[PDB]
Design an enzyme around this catalytic site. Sequence first.
Site, PDB file in Angstrom:
ATOM      1  N   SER A  98       0.872  -1.147   0.032  1.00 25.85           N
ATOM      2  CA  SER A  98      -0.069  -0.138   0.154  1.00 25.85           C
ATOM      3  C   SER A  98       0.971   1.201  -0.209  1.00 25.85           C
ATOM      4  CB  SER A  98      -0.909   0.007   1.125  1.00 25.85           C
ATOM      5  OG  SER A  98      -1.399  -1.315   1.090  1.00 25.85           O
ATOM      6  N   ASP A 145      -7.956  -2.170  -7.353  1.00 27.42           N
ATOM      7  CA  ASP A 145      -7.421  -2.032  -6.103  1.00 27.42           C
ATOM      8  C   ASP A 145      -8.324  -1.071  -5.269  1.00 27.42           C
ATOM      9  OD1 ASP A 145      -5.827  -0.395  -3.916  1.00 27.42           O
ATOM     10  OD2 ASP A 145      -4.762  -2.374  -3.936  1.00 27.42           O
ATOM     11  N   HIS A 149      -8.269  -5.336  -0.886  1.00 31.92           N
ATOM     12  CA  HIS A 149      -7.330  -4.654  -0.216  1.00 31.92           C
ATOM     13  C   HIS A 149      -6.228  -5.520   0.316  1.00 31.92           C
ATOM     14  CE1 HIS A 149     -10.316  -5.582   3.169  1.00 31.92           C
ATOM     15  NE2 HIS A 149      -9.296  -5.918   3.689  1.00 31.92           N
TER      16      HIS A 149
HETATM   17  C1  PZ8 Z   1       0.078   8.023  -2.728  1.00 34.76           C
HETATM   18  C2  PZ8 Z   1      -0.918   6.925  -2.164  1.00 34.76           C
HETATM   19  C3  PZ8 Z   1      -1.031   6.294  -0.937  1.00 34.76           C
HETATM   20  C4  PZ8 Z   1      -2.355   5.620  -0.941  1.00 34.76           C
HETATM   21  C5  PZ8 Z   1      -2.572   4.405  -0.057  1.00 34.76           C
HETATM   22  O1  PZ8 Z   1      -3.621   4.048  -0.272  1.00 34.76           O
HETATM   23  O2  PZ8 Z   1      -1.798   4.264   0.881  1.00 34.76           O
HETATM   24  C6  PZ8 Z   1      -3.042   6.156  -1.933  1.00 34.76           C
HETATM   25  C7  PZ8 Z   1      -4.337   6.068  -2.326  1.00 34.76           C
HETATM   26  N1  PZ8 Z   1      -2.511   7.246  -2.631  1.00 34.76           N
HETATM   27  C8  PZ8 Z   1      -2.905   7.985  -3.693  1.00 34.76           C
HETATM   28  C9  PZ8 Z   1      -3.142   9.329  -3.452  1.00 34.76           C
HETATM   29  C10 PZ8 Z   1      -3.517  10.194  -4.374  1.00 34.76           C
HETATM   30  C11 PZ8 Z   1      -3.995   9.616  -5.560  1.00 34.76           C
HETATM   31  C12 PZ8 Z   1      -3.880   8.387  -5.886  1.00 34.76           C
HETATM   32 CL1  PZ8 Z   1      -4.655   7.968  -7.190  1.00 34.76          CL
HETATM   33  C13 PZ8 Z   1      -3.359   7.571  -4.786  1.00 34.76           C
END
Ligand code: PZ8
Length: 351
Positions: free
Chosen positions: A145, A244, A293
Site C-alpha cells: 500500500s 485495488d 485490499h
Molecule cells: C499515494 C497514495 C497512497 C495511497 C494508499 O492507499 O496508501 C493512496 C490511495 N495514494 C494516492 C493518493 C492520491 C491519489 C492516488 Cl490515485 C493515490
Amino acid sequence: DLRLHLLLNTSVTCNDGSPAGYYLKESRGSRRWLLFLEGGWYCFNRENCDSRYDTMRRLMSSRDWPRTRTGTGILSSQPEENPYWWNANMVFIPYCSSDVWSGASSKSEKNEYAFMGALIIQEVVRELLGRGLSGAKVLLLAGSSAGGTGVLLNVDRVAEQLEKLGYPAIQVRGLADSGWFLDNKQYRHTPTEAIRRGIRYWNGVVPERCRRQFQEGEEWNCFFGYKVYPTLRSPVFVVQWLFDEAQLTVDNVHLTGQPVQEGLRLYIQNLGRELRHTLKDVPASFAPACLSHEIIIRSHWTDVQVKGTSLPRALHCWDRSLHDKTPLKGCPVHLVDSCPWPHCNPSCPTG
Ligand SMILES: Cc1cc(C(=O)O)c(C)n1-c1cccc(Cl)c1
Ligand SMILES: *[C@@H]1O[C@H](CO)[C@@H](O)[C@H](O)[C@H]1NC(C)=O
C-alpha cells in the site's frame, strides 16, 4: 518472532518525535534480507494529522509499539506459509511518518510533526549493516500500500546508500505491493492535490532521475508507479490488483450490492484496462483481476494465481531470472490478468 529495535539515532523519529524503529528476526544461515515497509495512507496538513494522531497513533508514534510482532505471509519463517523466502533475515519497518515514506523533515519550532520516512529507511539500513546486513547478497525492499509506493520512492536510494557506504556487492531489489496507482478521473467528483500539498508539508523527496524529468513543483508525478518505474535502476517486481480498493476509494467508487449500471461498468472496465496497460512493459509483475485490499504479508498470500502461477512461484522465478534476459521454461515472471471484471480470476480472495 520479530523483535523490536528502536533506532539508536534517536533524531530519526516518528511523527511525534518518538524514535522510529524496526522489527528483526535474524537467520544466520542466510545472506538474503527482506526489509518490509508497512502501509497505512498518509496525512497532509496539521488538522488531518491531528485527527490521525487521535485514532491511528501507532502510525504516528512508537510509544505504544509492542516488543514483538509475528511475521506473516512473505515475512513468515515457515516454508508452508512462505514458499519464497522463509529462510531470509526478516525486517518489518513500521510506518510512523504518514508521508508515503518520502519525508525528510524534523520536528522543530516550525513543525508540529516530523516527516522522516525516507530517513527512517536509510537509518534502518545503516544500523542493520552492523547486525549482519554487511554480509548480504540480496536486499529486497518490499512494502504494501503506502509502503509499496514507498518501495518505488526509496529502492534506488537504498542502492546508492549501500554503494557510497562501500557495499557494492549487495544487490538491492524492490517488491512494490498495492502501491501502483493511477492519477485518473474520479467516477464522481469530490486526491492528487493531497500528495502535492503533502510533499510540501513533509519536505518529501522523490528519486533523482524522476525528479529531473518532472522538475520543480511537479515531484508529485513520481508517486505514480507508471511514471516513476521507468526511471528506476534497481530491479522492481510490481504486485497490483487490477481493481485495488484504495484506488477505487480515491475514485469515489463503492461496489455494494445492487446491480452495476452501464456508466459504472464502463468505468470499472476502463480502470482495469488502464492498469493492465501500465504494466505491459513491466517484466516482473503479478496483477490479478480482483477487487481487494489484501496484501502480501497476509497468511494466505499463496492462494492467488494468475495463469496458474502463484505469487511465491513468480517471485522465485524472478530470483532465477536475476542469476548471473532469456525467459525461463515454466517459470514466468510477467503475470497480468486479461479478463476485464473483478473476480473473473477464480482464485481472487473471498474476504
Ligand atoms: C499515494 C497514495 C497512497 C495511497 C494508499 O492507499 O496508501 C493512496 C490511495 N495514494 C494516492 C493518493 C492520491 C491519489 C492516488 Cl490515485 C493515490
Ligand atoms: C542521525 O540522523 C540524522 C538524520 O538522518 C543525521 O543528520 C545525523 O547525522 C545522525 N546522527 C548520527 C550520530 O549518525
